[PDB]
Structures are given as C-alpha cells and as structure tokens.
Design an enzyme around this catalytic site. Structure first.
Site, short mmCIF file in Angstrom:
data_model
loop_
_atom_site.label_atom_id
_atom_site.label_comp_id
_atom_site.label_asym_id
_atom_site.label_seq_id
_atom_site.Cartn_x
_atom_site.Cartn_y
_atom_site.Cartn_z
N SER A 1 4.00 -15.74 3.91
CA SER A 1 5.41 -15.79 3.01
C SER A 1 4.87 -15.47 1.26
O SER A 1 6.12 -15.52 0.56
CB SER A 1 5.94 -16.88 2.89
OG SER A 1 6.48 -17.03 4.34
N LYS B 1 7.05 -13.12 -1.04
CA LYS B 1 8.58 -13.26 -1.30
C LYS B 1 8.78 -13.49 -2.82
O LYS B 1 9.95 -13.46 -3.33
CB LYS B 1 9.02 -14.58 -0.34
CG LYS B 1 9.23 -14.19 1.12
CD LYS B 1 9.19 -15.45 1.93
CE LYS B 1 9.06 -15.24 3.34
NZ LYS B 1 9.35 -16.30 4.35
N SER C 1 11.45 -20.57 1.55
CA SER C 1 10.47 -19.56 2.42
C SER C 1 11.28 -18.91 3.58
O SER C 1 10.72 -18.30 4.47
CB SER C 1 9.34 -20.07 3.09
OG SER C 1 8.18 -19.15 3.21
N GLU D 1 9.70 -9.82 8.48
CA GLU D 1 9.17 -11.32 9.04
C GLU D 1 9.92 -11.52 10.41
O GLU D 1 10.86 -11.00 10.56
CB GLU D 1 9.89 -12.66 8.20
CG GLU D 1 9.02 -12.75 6.80
CD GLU D 1 7.84 -13.42 6.74
OE1 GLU D 1 7.16 -13.56 7.88
OE2 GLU D 1 7.21 -14.23 5.71
N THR E 1 2.42 -19.77 5.23
CA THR E 1 1.66 -20.31 6.55
C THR E 1 1.89 -19.13 7.61
O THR E 1 3.31 -18.75 7.76
CB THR E 1 2.58 -21.52 7.09
OG1 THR E 1 2.43 -22.70 6.13
CG2 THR E 1 1.91 -22.09 8.46
#
Length: 266
Positions: free
Chosen positions: A46, A49, A107, A143, A214
């Site tokens: 992530s 972003k 996130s 994602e 993560t």
C-alpha cells in the site's frame, strides 16, 4: 562509528527476526543520509497510495481534476480492506478527495482502485513516477493482487532509495503547490494505520507523517517524512519477515525507527 552501529543493529535485527530490512533516508534534495539494502527490490504494498494522492493533487493543481468530483461505483468496486468504500456504497459515490483521503489515512483498497480507474490505471501511476524522476518504482496491478509479493516478481516493486527520493520530490521538490503539499503532509501525519510502526520508534518531539504497507510473504513497509532538530528528512522502510507474527512485524519496523533515531540524533 555511528554509521557502523546503524548497520550492525539492522543486521542484528535481520538475523534475530528472520527478516530483510530495506532503508533509505534522504535530505530534501534527495541526497543520501543513511541506507541498508537501499537498491534492493521490495514490494510496494500500500505504500504507493501516497504517490497516488500526489498524482491526484497534481491534476487538481493543474485544473485537470476536481476535488469534489463524484466518483460513482457499485458493489463490484469493493475488495478486501475497503472500509470507507463500503460505508459510501449505499450513497453511490465518493468524491476525488474523499477517496484519496481514504486511500492515504485508512489504506482503503476500493478507494485506491476507484482513483486508479479515473487517472489511467497502473500505467498512469507508473508514468507519474517516471515524470517525477523515479525510474524504478512500478505499479502493474490493482489492489489487492498488486500485493501478492511473488518470489522474484518485479511487478509492483520499488527500492528503498527510489521511493525515499520520490517522497523528497513530492514534499520538498516542488511537484505540488504549497497548499496541496500541505494537505498531503497533514494527511500523512493524521494517518490512522501507522501508530505501531515507524512513528512508534521515533521520539515524541518529531513531526512525522507516513504511509504504511502490509502484503504477502510478511511484507511490512512504511514511507514518509520526519522533522528532527528542525531538519526535514524523507524516509522509506521496506521489510519482509514471513516467519514473524502480525504484531512482531509492527515492532520490527518500529525497532528500525529506533535505529534511525540513534543515527540521526548522533
């Protein structure tokens, strides 16, 4: 020496915690303050972003996007970890700013995918990296699959140095207006996901803002900035610790933060 203690302490953590630790710290002009595995490839997870938000703000800045523009979507837009997107589903949209704020501070994957859809996908996100001087960072997928972190796969990776330099570019190198740079910095400071990672290991006097990551195969990452002793730094930490628990990965990044602290304060 101070620099040797940094190196030795990071390696000590790598052996004890069964981990690869990637670190890059740069000054506002992109020059190297400290590193470790700094040109090694790690999955972004992530962390991208935050750059995604930079790209969006640059379009707002230029007049080619509108902050309050409604981005419409249905349930198909929902993927794992989409907490803001799920809440706004009923209403039928999120604005550009709502979604970027969700992406950065929560996130939120759905909100990230919604923006990517609007700005031209992984390819556009990648060309934004290139346009601002990052020749390394690459987004290839949406994602959550961009975080698969498959052994040997170059897709969806950066290096610690390439991302730390990108961070310096966005915040201190004039890629965004002063007002847009300020908003992104506040968002990074008010991030809801990084309490147990990098800032857990920085002194309480430091102004720190960061974006966590993560993903698969024990990836735990944190990128952003800190102001220490009234100096500004850009930092990118990428780690892989497949044997470690959830909590231990957080504590690993925070421990890296303490190693950083000692080097900077010395």
């Amino acid at each position: 020496s101070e620099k040797l203690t940094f190196k030795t302490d990071l390696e000590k953590l790598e052996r004890e915690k069964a981990a690869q630790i990637g670190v890059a710290i740069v000054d506002p002009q992109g020059e190297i303050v400290a590193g470790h595995r700094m040109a090694q490839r790690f999955a972004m997870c992530s962390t991208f972003k935050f750059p995604l938000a930079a790209l969006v703000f640059e379009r707002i800045d230029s007049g080619t996007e509108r902050g309050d523009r409604k981005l419409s979507y249905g349930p198909d837009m929902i993927v794992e970890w989409s907490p803001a997107t799920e809440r706004f589903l009923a209403s039928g949209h999120m604005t550009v700013l709502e979604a970027a704020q969700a992406a950065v501070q929560l996130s939120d994957n759905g909100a990230t995918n919604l923006l990517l859809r609007e700005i031209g996908g992984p390819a556009a996100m990648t060309q934004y990296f290139r346009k601002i001087g990052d020749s390394v960072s690459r987004l290839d997928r949406k994602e959550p699959e961009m975080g698969d972190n498959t052994p040997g796969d170059l897709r969806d990776t950066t290096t610690p140095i390439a991302m730390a330099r990108t961070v310096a570019k966005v915040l201190y190198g004039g890629a965004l207006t002063s007002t847009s740079t300020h908003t992104i910095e506040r968002w990074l400071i008010g991030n809801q996901t990084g309490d147990a990672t990098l800032r857990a290991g920085f002194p309480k006097d430091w102004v720190v803002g960061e974006k966590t990551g993560t993903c698969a195969n024990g990836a735990r990452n944190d990128i952003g900035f800190f102001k220490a002793q009234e100096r500004d730094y850009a930092v990118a930490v990428y780690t892989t610790a497949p044997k470690l628990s959830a909590v231990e990965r957080d504590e690993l990044v925070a421990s890296v933060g303490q190693v950083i602290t000692q080097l900077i304060l010395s």
